[PDB]
Amino acid sequence: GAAARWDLCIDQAVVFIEDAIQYRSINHRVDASSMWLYRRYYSNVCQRTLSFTIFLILFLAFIETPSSLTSTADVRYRAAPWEPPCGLTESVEVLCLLVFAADLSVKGYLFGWAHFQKNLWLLGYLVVLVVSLVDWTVSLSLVCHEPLRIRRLLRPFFLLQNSSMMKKTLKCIRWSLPEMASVGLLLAIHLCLFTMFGMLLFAGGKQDDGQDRERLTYFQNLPESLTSLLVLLTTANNPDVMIPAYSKNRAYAIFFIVFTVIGSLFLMNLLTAIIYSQFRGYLMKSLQTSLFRRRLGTRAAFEVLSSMVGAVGVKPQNLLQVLQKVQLDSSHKQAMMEKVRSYGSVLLSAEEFQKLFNELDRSVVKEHPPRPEYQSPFLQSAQFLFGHYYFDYLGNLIALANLVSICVFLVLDADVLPAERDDFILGILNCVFIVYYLLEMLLKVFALGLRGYLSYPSNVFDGLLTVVLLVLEISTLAVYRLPHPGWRPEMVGLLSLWDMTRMLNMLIVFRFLRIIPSMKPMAVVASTVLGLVQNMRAFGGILVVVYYVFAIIGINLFRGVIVALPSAPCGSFEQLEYWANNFDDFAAALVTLWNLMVVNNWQVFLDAYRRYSGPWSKIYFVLWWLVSSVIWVNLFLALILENFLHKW
Amino acid sequence: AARWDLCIDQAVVFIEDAIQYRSINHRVDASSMWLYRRYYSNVCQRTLSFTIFLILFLAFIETPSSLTSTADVRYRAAPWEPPCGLTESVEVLCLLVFAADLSVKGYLFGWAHFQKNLWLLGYLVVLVVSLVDWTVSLSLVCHEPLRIRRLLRPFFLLQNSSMMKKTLKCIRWSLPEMASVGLLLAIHLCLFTMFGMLLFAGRLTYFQNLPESLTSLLVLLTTANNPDVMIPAYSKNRAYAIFFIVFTVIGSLFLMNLLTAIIYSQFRGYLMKSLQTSLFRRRLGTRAAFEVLSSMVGAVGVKPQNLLQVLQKVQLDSSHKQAMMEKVRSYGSVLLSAEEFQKLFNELDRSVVKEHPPRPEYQSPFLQSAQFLFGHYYFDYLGNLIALANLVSICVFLVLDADVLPAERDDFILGILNCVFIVYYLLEMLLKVFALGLRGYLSYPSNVFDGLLTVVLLVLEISTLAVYRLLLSLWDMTRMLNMLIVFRFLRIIPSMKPMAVVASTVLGLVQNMRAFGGILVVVYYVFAIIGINLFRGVIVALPSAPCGSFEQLEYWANNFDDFAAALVTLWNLMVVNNWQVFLDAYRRYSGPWSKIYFVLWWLVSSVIWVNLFLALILENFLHKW
Numbered sequence A: 001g002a003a004a005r006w007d008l009c010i011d012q013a014v015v016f017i018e019d020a021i022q023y024r025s026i027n028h029r030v031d032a033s034s035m036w037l038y039r040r041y042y043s044n045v046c047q048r049t050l051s052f053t054i055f056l057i058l059f060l061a062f063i064e065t066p067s068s069l070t071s072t073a074d075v076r077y078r079a080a081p082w083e084p085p086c087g088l089t090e091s092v093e094v095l096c097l098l099v100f101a102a103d104l105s106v107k108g109y110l111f112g113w114a115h116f117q118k119n120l121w122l123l124g125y126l127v128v129l130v131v132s133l134v135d136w137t138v139s140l141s142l143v144c145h146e147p148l149r150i151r152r153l154l155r156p157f158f159l160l161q162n163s164s165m166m167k168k169t170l171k172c173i174r175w176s177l178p179e180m181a182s183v184g185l186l187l188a189i190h191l192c193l194f195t196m197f198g199m200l201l202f203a204g205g206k207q208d209d210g211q212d213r214e215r216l217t218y219f220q221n222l223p224e225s226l227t228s229l230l231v232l233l234t235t236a237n238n239p240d241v242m243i244p245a246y247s248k249n250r251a252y253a254i255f256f257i258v259f260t261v262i263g264s265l266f267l268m269n270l271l272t273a274i275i276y277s278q279f280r281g282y283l284m285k286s287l288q289t290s291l292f293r294r295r296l297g298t299r300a301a302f303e304v305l306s307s308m309v310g311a312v313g314v315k316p317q318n319l320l321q322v323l324q325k326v327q328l329d330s331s332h333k334q335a336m337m338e339k340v341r342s343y344g345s346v347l348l349s350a351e352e353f354q355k356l357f358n359e360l361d362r363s364v365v366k367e368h369p370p371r372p373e374y375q376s377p378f379l380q381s382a383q384f385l386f387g388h389y390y391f392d393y394l395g396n397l398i399a400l401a402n403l404v405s406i407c408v409f410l411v412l413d414a415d416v417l418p419a420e421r422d423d424f425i426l427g428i429l430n431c432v433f434i435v436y437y438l439l440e441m442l443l444k445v446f447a448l449g450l451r452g453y454l455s456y457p458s459n460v461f462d463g464l465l466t467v468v469l470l471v472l473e474i475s476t477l478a479v480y481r482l483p484h485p486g487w488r489p490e491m492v493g494l495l496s497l498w499d500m501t502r503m504l505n506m507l508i509v510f511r512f513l514r515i516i517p518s519m520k521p522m523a524v525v526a527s528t529v530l531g532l533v534q535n536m537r538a539f540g541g542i543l544v545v546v547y548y549v550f551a552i553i554g555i556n557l558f559r560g561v562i563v564a565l566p567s568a569p570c571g572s573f574e575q576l577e578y579w580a581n582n583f584d585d586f587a588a589a590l591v592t593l594w595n596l597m598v599v600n601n602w603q604v605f606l607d608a609y610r611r612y613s614g615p616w617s618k619i620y621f622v623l624w625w626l627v628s629s630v631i632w633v634n635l636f637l638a639l640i641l642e643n644f645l646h647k648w
Numbered sequence B: 001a002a003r004w005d006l007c008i009d010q011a012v013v014f015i016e017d018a019i020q021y022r023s024i025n026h027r028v029d030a031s032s033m034w035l036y037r038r039y040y041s042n043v044c045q046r047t048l049s050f051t052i053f054l055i056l057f058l059a060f061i062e063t064p065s066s067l068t069s070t071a072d073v074r075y076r077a078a079p080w081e082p083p084c085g086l087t088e089s090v091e092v093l094c095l096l097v098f099a100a101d102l103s104v105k106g107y108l109f110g111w112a113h114f115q116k117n118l119w120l121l122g123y124l125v126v127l128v129v130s131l132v133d134w135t136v137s138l139s140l141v142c143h144e145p146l147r148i149r150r151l152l153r154p155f156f157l158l159q160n161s162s163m164m165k166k167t168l169k170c171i172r173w174s175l176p177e178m179a180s181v182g183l184l185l186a187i188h189l190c191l192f193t194m195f196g197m198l199l200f201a202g203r204l205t206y207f208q209n210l211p212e213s214l215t216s217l218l219v220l221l222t223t224a225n226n227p228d229v230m231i232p233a234y235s236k237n238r239a240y241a242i243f244f245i246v247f248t249v250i251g252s253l254f255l256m257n258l259l260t261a262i263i264y265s266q267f268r269g270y271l272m273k274s275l276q277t278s279l280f281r282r283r284l285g286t287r288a289a290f291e292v293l294s295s296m297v298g299a300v301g302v303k304p305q306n307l308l309q310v311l312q313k314v315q316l317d318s319s320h321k322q323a324m325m326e327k328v329r330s331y332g333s334v335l336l337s338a339e340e341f342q343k344l345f346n347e348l349d350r351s352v353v354k355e356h357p358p359r360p361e362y363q364s365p366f367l368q369s370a371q372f373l374f375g376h377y378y379f380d381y382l383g384n385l386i387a388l389a390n391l392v393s394i395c396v397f398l399v400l401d402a403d404v405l406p407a408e409r410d411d412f413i414l415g416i417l418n419c420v421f422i423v424y425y426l427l428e429m430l431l432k433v434f435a436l437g438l439r440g441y442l443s444y445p446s447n448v449f450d451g452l453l454t455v456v457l458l459v460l461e462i463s464t465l466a467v468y469r470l471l472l473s474l475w476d477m478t479r480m481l482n483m484l485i486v487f488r489f490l491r492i493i494p495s496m497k498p499m500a501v502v503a504s505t506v507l508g509l510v511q512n513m514r515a516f517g518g519i520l521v522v523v524y525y526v527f528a529i530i531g532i533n534l535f536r537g538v539i540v541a542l543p544s545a546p547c548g549s550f551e552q553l554e555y556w557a558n559n560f561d562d563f564a565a566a567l568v569t570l571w572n573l574m575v576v577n578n579w580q581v582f583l584d585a586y587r588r589y590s591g592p593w594s595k596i597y598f599v600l601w602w603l604v605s606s607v608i609w610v611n612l613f614l615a616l617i618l619e620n621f622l623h624k625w
């Protein structure tokens, strides 16, 4: 059994090295079959399948019984959505839940039973799966007649369970929670004290006066004063809340000013600073944990390989075979194996082993495939001329000319009648510029080779853009037959292809926006954008979870409360025609929650839902303002600060 | 001879500069040292600060007099127009004070330093321009509409504050990146305008022509019309919302906070750098004083008797001065070395804690329990509980009397409860004074605040009981009493620790935010004066309005007819809410070319209010933690 244990130790070294490369903790059980199961489960295919299943189970909310498949979200104009049959979404959800159960079983087998019991995330996964399956069985025993599906609230949790960055962000929020709670208590005391002071201050005065008007409009009773001051805390009705009092007497504004100085200025920014105080070393801590995990992986692999000899160390042949069996990029794998081959038969110690496995911190520069060579001197000279970077200068100049022409002929044509436009010069210029784009793409492909041209991301991007523009232009020319003087390119019922062509042609500006890191001031902005996109998961997952949970709650609460009866106050929900901001389906719920995250016109929604669904509904919206506009927006600002100050 | 006096006076002034963290570039002569001590005295600095305050406050009583009860154009009475000579004589007195200050600054420091210092050259230029403008405005009989000299007033404040010169130096360093972010935001606006004009106009309300599209997108950038700008399109099709959403993601959320990040990247170690510079100045001052005292002797060292004479002359806190003097006495007649001299002046960093006077020391058997109970914080918690009960009673009587007019009925029970609670407050104050002594009780700022407020409450309650129950109405004096009780309820914040820590943090932030306050004052002053010069009499109440217009919302009080109304209008514009209402109003009244002023105000005001202020709060919060 010596050979069996030898190959088992080789497999242990391989899996430990793979964990070190992928920054995975070494806590899973190491067995003959468990190693194969671990390498199969953490493969790219299985992880992509799990992520797609999570995406599908989140996307099912768009196709549930409150279907989100209508052209418009306005209550007045929306038609009945396509209601899916009972078994369709239930079957899709049950297959997603079976996939999740398989994933949970694999996770619970790869790790120990003790680890599964001790881990709170796996216990929560099991509880959520059991509750979701029970709710699905209940909702299927009745024939899709359960109005509220609690399982839909637990769908975001899966997204939390399969993301380490999301869990780190949640932990940072948890750490920031006590100071935020203390500041919130102070702010509630502030709100209550100013509410009582306002109610007592605007109580007197003559009838129909400015002070009496202020009392009637905003500070009549305690809940209305509380709502008014809470909205003023978000500065959503800053002039309206004080216009009557400020017109009655000039000094009253002082009061409101003090409020905005204390509540909206000091305490909200204090909350922002508190939330940022926990994301202060986010990226640095993540890098430190990644390096620590890599070091642990390499150390454990060395320790495993050392026992195979029984001085301590790893034989070069065993390390070479392990590197041969390790899933790694070609450059790093080849460099590491050549460095191992450089060592003779002498055993490798732990320190030199770790220094060898420090080669994985090298950012390999991928060389673009060489351009094909042409024997003809004229052909190769033309290839050199067209492959020169000054050709990109000429292309950018022509692109700027195209963009300026499109903008000018859009501004000019806004004044003239919609049916008397000529669009001849603009059509000719667009045709010429699209032909030039096609010629430039063909020349670049000729000079750099098809694979070489497609190697660059900017080159493939502009190639796709010019292909789409060429298709649109050819279709337009085929429909409208070679523009002439007075060539109207818009016809009723012809999809308005001209507008689509000009809108896709306005994506040219990326040719100039992608070269902004050239100037020094824009370099830090570009670095911040890149870091925020790389760390997009940290805030994006929290955003998705919050929006999903609150959309489901709103649909369960405010499904059919806003109905237009077949005169309204000037500042009301009906007069502004906000009927499209309802909770009748998932997309409308998401748009309404977005419009509420932007605290503007918050009191309009508050009053509308107080009148339609009840006075207590405000609580929900208040919670929304606490969860999205206060916690998540400050989280995004903290991540922006961290990504800006990381490199700098 | 007199050289000994000169040396000891130079040592005294150097020690004072080290204590106050000032430079040593000032000339040190017999007369110059006396002038330096007089000029940097507390009296002269307070006088200069008050003169700056007065010259800034004169804008409230200028020709557009801000002396009307209301700011509504419909109801505003004719303001009291001051005579021609009054505010001109006050301003010329302030300018003469500033000229004296500038001459003293140019005399104490070298003429070469004055020539090389750009701030002093700017001070001289501003003073000369202000005097010329004042003479011109006085040659005419106060008939110059625009006073250019009024725009240069805030500079005086800016010239006197050293903290503002550093917050401006940091803003100057952050300007190259804020300019790039502004260029990116302008590109964002232009691209989304030229895209919406194709998407929607190809509508009549928000994206009809180029100026309307630009204004609509800029307002959405400030999120002042977020649902309104999208309702006409989001009603036609859901996907259109995506467009606006993308905008709000790119401009309002990302770039407007990238501005905050850019500003904070410069204030990252502002407090630490200031502290290091202050310590360096203190060390340099102590070193210069040591060198002077060593030169006085005639090895190198400070004679302890000379050092005691210097400390005697030095204006310093009694505790630190006595500690240093007794340390020098303990040194005896031994000559002090350079390192010992440097380490001697570390006593000022001891941060001496103020002690409280002892308890009255009454008899034990009869009053020991009383002393223990009243001195204990459980009595303070009982007082807080009773204050909360008073607050609950006020809330109950507000809620029950909300349906009817609060002034009508149901105030007898509230009156009795307030009388009982004020009696309890008086009893608690008397018991605390008994347990701590009058000077002991007044030592604590919370205790003196509580005592003052309960004295005011008792006076008002007794007056109301005597006059009515048997000038102001009964309801007005009940409003005053209830508002004073609500204000008194603030005592619960220092007591409760979770609120007390946050209150202390907020107070420390306020104490360190004076540079932000000065910058805000400068910006508000300049923009208010420009708005008065531009939009003075444009908004008039014609003797029907659209539902969401300037007239239907009755925003008439937000005008620029006077300085206070200008300040309130600039405040209401700083809070970007309902920005489009003012934009449309002044477009219709003052002409199309008025959005430039409001856009410049939005930039200069939103930066200060959101990004610079958040950067300062971040720095101040992280330094303490």
Ligand SMILES: CC(C)CCC[C@@H](C)[C@H]1CC[C@H]2[C@@H]3CC=C4C[C@@H](OC(=O)CCC(=O)O)CC[C@]4(C)[C@H]3CC[C@]12C
Pocket: A062, A068, A069, A070, A071, A079, A587, A590, A591, B237, B238, B239, B241, B242, B245
């Ligand atoms: C942030 C929000 C706005 C994102 C929403 C994304 C999707 C949920 C939306 C975007 C556009 C919508 C589509 C717009 C138009 C139509 C055509 C519509 O066709 C009809 O016959 C509608 C009813 C009718 O008019 O008769 C069916 C729904 C559908 C596909 C909609 C389905 C839901 C979509 C994909």
Ligand SMILES: CC(C)CCC[C@@H](C)[C@H]1CC[C@H]2[C@@H]3CC=C4C[C@@H](OC(=O)CCC(=O)O)CC[C@]4(C)[C@H]3CC[C@]12C
Pocket: A193, A194, A197, A211, A248, A249, A251, A252, A254, A255, A256, A258, A259, B486, B487
């Ligand atoms: C924390 C809370 C509970 C107390 C502190 C809140 C402050 C914002 C208060 C404390 C004193 C208040 C002031 C007390 C008295 C007056 C005079 C008052 O004058 C009139 O109403 C006279 C004209 C008329 O009644 O028609 C206008 C409000 C004002 C300035 C108040 C404005 C609001 C102030 C500054």
Ligand SMILES: CC(C)CCC[C@@H](C)[C@H]1CC[C@H]2[C@@H]3CC=C4C[C@@H](OC(=O)CCC(=O)O)CC[C@]4(C)[C@H]3CC[C@]12C
Pocket: A184, A185, A187, A188, A191, A223, A224, A226, A227, A230, A615, A616, A617, A618, A619, A622
């Ligand atoms: C900074 C944070 C911590 C502030 C949190 C404030 C909330 C605790 C306040 C603000 C608005 C308040 C609400 C304002 C109005 C009402 C209606 C009120 O009911 C009525 O108006 C009575 C008539 C009826 O219910 O029909 C019940 C309390 C409630 C929900 C309030 C509950 C407490 C709320 C959510």
Ligand SMILES: CC(C)CCC[C@@H](C)[C@H]1CC[C@H]2[C@@H]3CC=C4C[C@@H](OC(=O)CCC(=O)O)CC[C@]4(C)[C@H]3CC[C@]12C
Pocket: A250, A251, A252, A253, A254, A257, B060, B066, B067, B068, B069, B077, B564, B567, B568
């Ligand atoms: C941020 C802003 C709101 C601060 C404004 C502060 C001052 C410029 C204001 C606050 C209260 C005002 C006072 C309120 C009431 C009066 C009584 C008023 O008496 C009248 O007879 C007015 C005309 C009339 O009603 O007949 C004269 C102006 C005066 C002192 C006003 C002068 C200007 C004051 C001091």
Ligand SMILES: CC(C)CCC[C@@H](C)[C@H]1CC[C@H]2[C@@H]3CC=C4C[C@@H](OC(=O)CCC(=O)O)CC[C@]4(C)[C@H]3CC[C@]12C
Pocket: B182, B183, B185, B186, B189, B211, B212, B214, B215, B218, B592, B593, B594, B595, B596, B599
């Ligand atoms: C991120 C920052 C740097 C963006 C700055 C953008 C400004 C330079 C733009 C945005 C809004 C623009 C304004 C939008 C609308 C108008 C009205 C427009 O009016 C007309 O000339 C047509 C109507 C008429 O003449 O009656 C004149 C230009 C102006 C002031 C524009 C001037 C340029 C402004 C201030």
Ligand SMILES: CC(C)CCC[C@@H](C)[C@H]1CC[C@H]2[C@@H]3CC=C4C[C@@H](OC(=O)CCC(=O)O)CC[C@]4(C)[C@H]3CC[C@]12C
Pocket: A506, A507, A509, B191, B192, B195, B236, B237, B239, B240, B242, B243, B244, B246, B247
């Ligand atoms: C530099 C900038 C200009 C690039 C990014 C701008 C985006 C906000 C644009 C680019 C493509 C646009 C989309 C192009 C086409 C459509 C289909 C369009 O469909 C209809 O209007 C059909 C139904 C109807 O008209 O009733 C709705 C807007 C939408 C999703 C657009 C939404 C806004 C988008 C995402």
Ligand SMILES: COc1cc2c(cc1Oc1ccccc1)[C@H](Cc1ccc(Oc3ccccc3)cc1)N(C)CC2
Pocket: A389, A392, A393, A396, A397, A400, A512, A513, A515, A518, A519, B187
């Ligand atoms: C291959 O092509 C180029 C290469 C390089 C540049 C530019 C190029 O292309 C153009 C040249 C001229 C006009 C248009 C495109 C820049 C110069 C540059 C700097 C800032 C700019 O900022 C904007 C201007 C307008 C709109 C948006 C941003 C734009 C260009 N160099 C400094 C580096 C290499």
